[PDB]
Amino acid sequence: SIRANRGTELECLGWEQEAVLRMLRNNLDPEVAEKPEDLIVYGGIGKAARDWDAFHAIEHSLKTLKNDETLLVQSGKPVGMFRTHPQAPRVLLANSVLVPKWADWEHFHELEKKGLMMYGQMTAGSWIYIGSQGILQGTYETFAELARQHFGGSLKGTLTLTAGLGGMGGAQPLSVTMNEGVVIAVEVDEKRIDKRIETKYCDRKTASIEEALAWAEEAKLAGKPLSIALLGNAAEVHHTLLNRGVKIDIVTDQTSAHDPLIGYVPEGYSLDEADRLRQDTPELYVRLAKQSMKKHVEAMLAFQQKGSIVFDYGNNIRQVAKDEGLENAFDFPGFVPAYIRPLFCEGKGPFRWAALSGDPADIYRTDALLKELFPTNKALHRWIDMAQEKVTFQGLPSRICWLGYGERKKMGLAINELVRTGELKAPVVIGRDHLDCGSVASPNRETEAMKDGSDAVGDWAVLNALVNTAAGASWVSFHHGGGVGMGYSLHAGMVAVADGSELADERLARVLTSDPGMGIIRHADAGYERAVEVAKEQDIIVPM
Amino acid sequence: SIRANRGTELECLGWEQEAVLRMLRNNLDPEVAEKPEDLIVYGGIGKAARDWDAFHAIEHSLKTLKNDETLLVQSGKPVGMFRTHPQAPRVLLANSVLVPKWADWEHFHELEKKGLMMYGQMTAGSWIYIGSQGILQGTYETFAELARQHFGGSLKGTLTLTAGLGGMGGAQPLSVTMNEGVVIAVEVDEKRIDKRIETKYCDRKTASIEEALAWAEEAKLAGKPLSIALLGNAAEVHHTLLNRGVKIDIVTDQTSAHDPLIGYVPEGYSLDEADRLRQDTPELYVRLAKQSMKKHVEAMLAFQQKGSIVFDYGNNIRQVAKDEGLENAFDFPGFVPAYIRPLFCEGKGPFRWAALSGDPADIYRTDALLKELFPTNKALHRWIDMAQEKVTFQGLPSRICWLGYGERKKMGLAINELVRTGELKAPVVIGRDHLDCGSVASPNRETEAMKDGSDAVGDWAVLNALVNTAAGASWVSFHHGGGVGMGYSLHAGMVAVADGSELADERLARVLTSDPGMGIIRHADAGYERAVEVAKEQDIIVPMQK
């Protein structure tokens, strides 16, 4: 049982290096991770380190790492260490990167068996995962925007259908609930449902569809919010609800479709049976899993034709159905081009922070800070109040709060000031998911249907990592295949520590500017007016 | 026509930024580039900037760029500029990167015509190209090691057959010749042949196969070295040489097979006809080009089966043949696993430097410098002597000289010392090709047949770019598809400026250690014994070790 150290006592030579060690450990905290005993944090086999030997080597390196040194991590394995500068990142990570022609699961697995690979997902291998909260606001905003577009600005009296109650998928129920809606989420592993119930991310659970629908109608009628976890296999249940004529307003999905071998259970198999299918006949498992997802998607399309609003929530499931012959698998859009992109054009993203002290008092303090720095932003305050009331901390106390260009720097510098004066009991790590305004290229998700068709351009993601290393981040990462699977994405991550020092003030101002700035210029280059405007408004250099 | 500024006069706010401006221009110097009117430096369409407008914007940005600022270049286009630190790179570049599933020439061309793409090759888009000399020692060393392996340690008395006399391929003739051998290099464009001849990278030329064979035979007997450029199409010429029973000792190739649309002329078409075929029916063109490259490779396999030593010289030709149906296209090895890999295990690679002064005297001075710093190293002295004797400068006087781990830092700090005292008349840029011991991932070339089977792992190339940025290089780049084409490689470049300042001494010591250091830890991780030895000898940290 691994968990981040608490307090002000260090195990490393400096706070910046201790921050890495604590966040690495926090990623594997039983309250945080989905299956830490196997180093799995979330999203299928998204791991924190290659294996246990690698894990322990990183810990040792981190404790002896000097203030002007940089540790190199290659797919969860510490592979080198060189002298740099106090302003350079303490750690540099490159996880799951494969030459394009070999960027598929088949080759990944071949390298994995040889002990040469690890799947870092986005925040799993870059140590900045904060439990189900990380994606919460992202999922909340997506549904909130969908609400304003089709239901008058609220999901009150509407029923949402989805599946997948894992680390990140588990945030779907609370997201719909916070928007005042009713939701039924299908999950095939009761253990997963319990995790969501225990952590307050889902209200109820049931194994019978009849009971689920009765609760949903009752809540929809009384116009009250309600989350219901339905035990079953979505590929099957969705068709049952479909052929029963149930009225479903919104349909999406978040099973780990990006990984046919691990993330999706084939219809007709119990978990035990599926486990054996997976172990004994892996290739059979995949063929059957793919067939199930094709069927799962046919059901989503049927709902869309029936009138419900349907969208892909970034698990690449549409691609899987497409690959099986479903020519119209992409008849419904991805949540980014449909609901979130405008937020990116303002430099907004899943910006977040964690209190190394371990004391929630620090998070509450940063929460009040937000209101002090942005007194006129009603929505921001509404979000913080919801967060404080409905989110239960996991591992080190943390906060998800989408801030845009400028707002990030301002918050980061303020946080560092409170760490220095002591209002914040210990240093705080500032980070984000790799899904952000200027850190990722992913044709089936974040960069789906860019107005200029630059969907596949991966230069920006690479530039994001390069500039943030130059700007002075604490640890920078470059991953491949996060979210959508092998061959479908390239993205970067950035974490900077606010230890209260003057050095941090310098680095924070720089990197908290470059990171979101990157997002503004990428969208300005694509021709998004709001982004072009933000550039002029906050003096973001756009050469041409 | 464009060329690098010369002298101590500055157009930028500092020498580091000035260095960028001059290497950028030097890349398009008529003396250096293959087709600078279209921003083309070498290797098919490897360019220096997306288009002319992008080029001029870069210049303007470079002239106002401050000592603690960083310009961002995306596929040859300046897209942003942020405040960083004096030790952070002045320019960060990401060229040609495409999400894997879309990393093919079809999607590249689609984006390119929309003005959304540029092929950076390796040193074209990262402004560190120095004419044909850049790859010269690499090619010399390849043939040198091959000689030791199959011909007693010399090519004297052997005949090599190859093709491709472009910017990089043009170094083949001289490379064989420097090994005392005889070579016939087939080139379909006479203007390309004249270019090699004028730059002294090739001895003679002829459009007569008969004449060529007679010159080679005469020389192979007299035991004299001789390079012959043969006007023609390899697809056809090689089969003629094969079917007439010519005795050929070594066969390789260096046409631009990595780019079917631009780099290979289909058999049976004049250059003028191929241009129209290419503009009008690009898809048909590619089909015909691939058809011809298959025939070309079938001839190479025939020579091998006939007893000649054959090898792929990094243009991905084997792949193009394989994709066409030649099931045994990979019957001959790539030069890296066969001849160069041991060098990478020493952290060696196409290390290079250029004199921003524009005065060859600075280079001759660095040539003497090398000997002073490594007075015991006979091999190093011999190479530098050959280069200074056989290499005619192009654009800013520059020197290619392979240095391994440790040696790079020593030479770099020494050079900086000479810039400080004034013996060197101006700052010098220290760089290299993206092909190096720890900067690239390329299953069909640099990482072909890694002993642990880690061929396709691309993490190290990324880490290379990342570490050098942290180390304090002047400009770092990360490209996709260099050398072998779209989808086949990921790699990083690194350039550092020795301007005589103390800031440079510190940055130089840091980055000239990390760059080659990465090469050592990558091969050691793969299990290469010499690499593990060098790590122990130099105390290079390998975290998994207790």
Ligand SMILES: NC(=O)c1ccc[n+]([C@@H]2O[C@H](COP(=O)([O-])OP(=O)(O)OC[C@H]3O[C@@H](n4cnc5c(N)ncnc54)[C@H](O)[C@@H]3O)[C@@H](O)[C@H]2O)c1
């Ligand atoms: N859009 C985003 O912002 C975002 C962010 C993070 C992760 N993701 C993606 O979301 C997906 C889920 O991530 P996660 O961390 O929750 O994954 P996870 O691996 O932790 O959980 C996946 C869940 O899918 C369930 N499942 C598999 N087959 C099923 C079936 N047939 N019916 C019902 N449930 C089934 C599993 O039992 C499990 O609980 C992944 O594809 C991931 O990459 C998206």
Ligand SMILES: NC(=O)c1ccc[n+]([C@@H]2O[C@H](COP(=O)([O-])OP(=O)(O)OC[C@H]3O[C@@H](n4cnc5c(N)ncnc54)[C@H](O)[C@@H]3O)[C@@H](O)[C@H]2O)c1
């Ligand atoms: N192994 C290495 O260290 C290394 C280094 C740099 C470049 N390269 C590769 O070498 C190749 C050539 O590079 P370059 O800069 O010389 O390219 P280039 O585009 O400048 O020149 C290619 C030459 O091929 C010729 N050609 C095309 N079809 C021909 C035919 N049928 N017969 C004879 N000649 C023909 C062209 O006329 C041209 O002169 C590329 O594939 C490049 O990526 C390898």
